[PDB]
Design a protein that fits this description.
155 residues, SBP, four-stranded parallel beta sheet, transport protein, substrate binding protein, monomer, alpha/beta, two-stranded antiparallel ribbon, ABC-type uncharacterized transport system periplasmic component-like protein, 7 helices, 43% helix, signal
Length: 155
């Protein structure tokens, strides 16, 4: 239940100084009109440049991901939902493997991504936002969890 702007603010905290982030967006996902304007707005708000590469089928995943790196020099991969294409194991594992090889952490929509090598996900409860972290990947990627969340954070 964590909004895009809240997510990108957490990313800013986990990765201070981050300038550019890449998003792989499933063109056929619901709430595309809700979400993509929100991305433009989260970007404005955090000062992190958000570059969206949209994908419509599995065969576009590899070349769209490569464009984020080739043309935009993003420092992380941000995935916002997984209702269609991005729920496919092939897409998920391609993205995590290649983000990792390129040295970039993956901020993911569910814990399933963390078990495969993504770095951080999130959920909301009544007390607020909880970070979920893949400790091993975070450590290797130089991601330090700030003390204020350390209590909240599930590993």
């Amino acid at each position: 239940e964590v909004t895009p702007i809240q997510q990108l603010f957490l990313i800013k905290e986990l990765k201070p100084g981050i300038a550019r982030i890449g998003v792989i967006w499933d063109k056929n996902a619901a709430n595309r009109d809700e979400v993509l304007p929100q991305l433009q707005r989260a970007s404005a708000a955090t000062g992190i440049k958000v570059v969206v590469a949209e994908v419509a089928s599995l065969q576009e995943v590899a070349p769209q991901f490569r464009t984020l790196l080739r043309d935009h020099q993003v420092e992380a991969l941000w995935v916002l939902e997984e209702s269609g294409l991005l729920g496919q194991a092939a897409a998920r594992s391609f993205l995590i493997k290649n983000a990792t090889q390129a040295g970039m952490p993956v901020f993911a929509p569910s814990e399933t991504w963390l078990k495969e090598g993504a770095c951080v996900t999130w959920r909301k409860d009544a007390e607020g936002i909880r970070l979920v972290v893949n400790k091993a990947v975070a450590e290797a990627m130089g991601i330090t969890i700030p003390a204020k969340y350390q209590d909240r954070t599930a590993f």
